[PDB]
């Protein structure tokens, strides 16, 4: 339902309408920010590493695999969500697409 697209450095490039309702940020506020603003520690402080790691090893842990994780809303509250992630190229640069499913109220 909710879709988020980030660039190779973790910066949000697209934030769908459902994502706004789910995380509390507006599309304009979300775009330009690191995707780690949507998660609690320790993932938050480590997410950039996860991405760099994947980019240098090309060994997926979540891409094409999926996982249930905890996200964080604008107000600071945490919730369960399923995440599916894909990768694609545009203009020779990588972009990651994420499908987010809220398990708090599906």
Asked if 12 and 50 count as a contact pair (C-beta separation under 8 A), the reply is no
**Binding partner selected for residue 84 from Cl ion, ligand HEM, Na ion, none, CB under the kind-specific 5 to 8 Å limit:** Cl ion
Stretch that binds Cl ion, among 6-14, 17-25, 30-38, 60-68 (CB under 5 A): 60-68
Q: Closest-CB residue for Cl ion?
A: 66
Is residue 103 a contact partner of residue 81, using CB atoms and an 8 Å limit? yes
Report the C-alpha gap between 49 and 76 in whole angstroms: 23
Does 39 engage in binding with ligand HEM (CB under 6 A)? yes
Judged by CB under 5 A, does residue 84 bind Cl ion? yes
User: Does residue 14 touch Na ion according to CB under 5 A?
Assistant: no
Report, in Å, the least distance between residue 76 CB and ligand HEM: 14
C-alpha–C-alpha distance, residues 21 and 90, integer Å: 28
Interior/surface letters 70-80, b for 16+ CB within 10 angstroms, e for the rest:
ebbeeeeeeee
Q: Which residues line the annotated binding site for heme? A: 47
Q: Name the residues that contact Cl ion, by CB under 5 A.
A: 66, 84
Which residues contact Na ion (rule: CB under 5 A)? 31-32, 65-66
């Amino acid at each position: 339902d909710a879709m988020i697209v980030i660039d190779g450095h973790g910066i949000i490039q697209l934030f769908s309408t459902a994502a706004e309702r789910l995380f509390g940020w507006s599309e304009l506020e979300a775009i330009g920010q690191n995707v780690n603003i949507l998660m609690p520690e320790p993932d938050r402080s480590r997410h950039d590493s996860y991405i760099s790691r994947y980019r240098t090893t090309s060994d997926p842990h979540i891409i094409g695999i999926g996982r249930i994780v905890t996200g964080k809303r604008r107000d600071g509250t945490t919730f369960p969500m399923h995440l599916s992630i894909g990768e694609m190229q545009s203009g020779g640069e990588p972009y990651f697409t994420g499908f987010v499913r809220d398990l708090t109220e599906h």
